[PDB]
Design a binder for this molecule. Sequence first.
Ligand SMILES: OC[C@H]1O[C@@H](O[C@H]2[C@H](O)[C@@H](O)[C@@H](O[C@H]3[C@H](O)[C@@H](O)[C@@H](O[C@H]4[C@H](O)[C@@H](O)[C@@H](O)O[C@@H]4CO)O[C@@H]3CO)O[C@@H]2CO)[C@H](O)[C@H](O)[C@@H]1O
Length: 388
Amino acid sequence: ELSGTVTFWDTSNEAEKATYQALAEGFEKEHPKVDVKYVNVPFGEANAKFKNAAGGNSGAPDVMRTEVAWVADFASIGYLAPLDGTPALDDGSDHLPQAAASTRYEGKTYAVPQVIDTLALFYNKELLTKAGVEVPGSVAELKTAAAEITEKTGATGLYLRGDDPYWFLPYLYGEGGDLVDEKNKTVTVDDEAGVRAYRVIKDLVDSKAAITDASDGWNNMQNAFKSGKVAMMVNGPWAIEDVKAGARFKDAGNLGVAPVPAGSAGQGSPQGGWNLSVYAGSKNLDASYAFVKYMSSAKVQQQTTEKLSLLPTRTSVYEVPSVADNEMVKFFKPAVDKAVERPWIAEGNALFEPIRLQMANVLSGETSPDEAAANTGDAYRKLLKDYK
Ligand SMILES: OC[C@H]1O[C@@H](O[C@H]2[C@H](O)[C@@H](O)[C@@H](O[C@H]3[C@H](O)[C@@H](O)[C@@H](O[C@H]4[C@H](O)[C@@H](O)[C@@H](O)O[C@@H]4CO)O[C@@H]3CO)O[C@@H]2CO)[C@H](O)[C@H](O)[C@@H]1O
């Protein structure tokens, strides 16, 4: 028997949330004595809100949509129920290895994978065609393309997200860099690749190839792309249905997607995504395990793709013709296969704030690329006491 309340905190965005609420409530079809209480929690607030609730054992959710870096974060402070040997885990081996890695902390499973993602270059096909340019493969090509776009159409080439540090990573990887060398416990962000990456973002804006904003970056990016103010943006699968709501991208026929541009050394995009965790203090652990199994099942992952084009973590789901033949999936899955995995460490989540501050200050001209890289390195060494 399953009965009682399962409160689910979902972080999905305005375009995704109706789908996720319907899926969550569908758990009640097979378990009518369970009451699913769906709550949508803003992404930026959710980590803090969960810690506040879990630390005061006061209004915590039973099931938490848990960003890949939040698993080790929450788990290290005891907020997550261990899932090994529980009904929450079913056909575990189906999940992509890199998705499974993010669910683990100190030899225990604290989450089940839900979606996997990476960043890509979205582009407005009509604008590029009008400008007579090809989708750019590199930053150098992007600069050239942007000039032609402005000359021939008046649009700016790129919206460069300046207020979210995750958007720094493609530039860092393209310059031949990474945050840390996990295996050797060495901070690497302040290597010359870090300097180069901060210089690249500043040059893109100064040269007018790109525009940016120091605040409200999600809305500003989406607005600029949807309104044709820019021809390109870097974004993820969570943006697809949001973009398609716009007059300019109905049915996605005008929406192109390609890999993030290479830099001077090579090319790369980060691995991200979401898992599902159970609050350690839940008063309905059984019903929660079953809710997690349900939300992470092949059936529900397939539905999510069909409604939202989010990428399944289950390998088996990619063999479903409906998923295999989805064009956003056909592009994003290979890109995900190549995505750079991060260290799944308690402090991994905290690696982002230092980038955020230095990136803002580079873009405004308050901080040189050289100082920004050094500052980011210093911040990491403070965070990671056993890293050189
Ligand atoms: O570490 C967590 C805290 O720090 C910052 O989070 C990071 C995060 O660890 C990174 O992996 C990356 O998160 C991205 C995520 O993986 C993507 O899926 C995407 O998230 C969107 C969801 O897909 C969508 O459903 C809805 O929830 O909106 C999300 C946001 O658009 O994009 C994420 C990046 O925006 O990057 C962030 C750094 O921003 C962050 O500071 C938080 O406060 C975390 O607590």
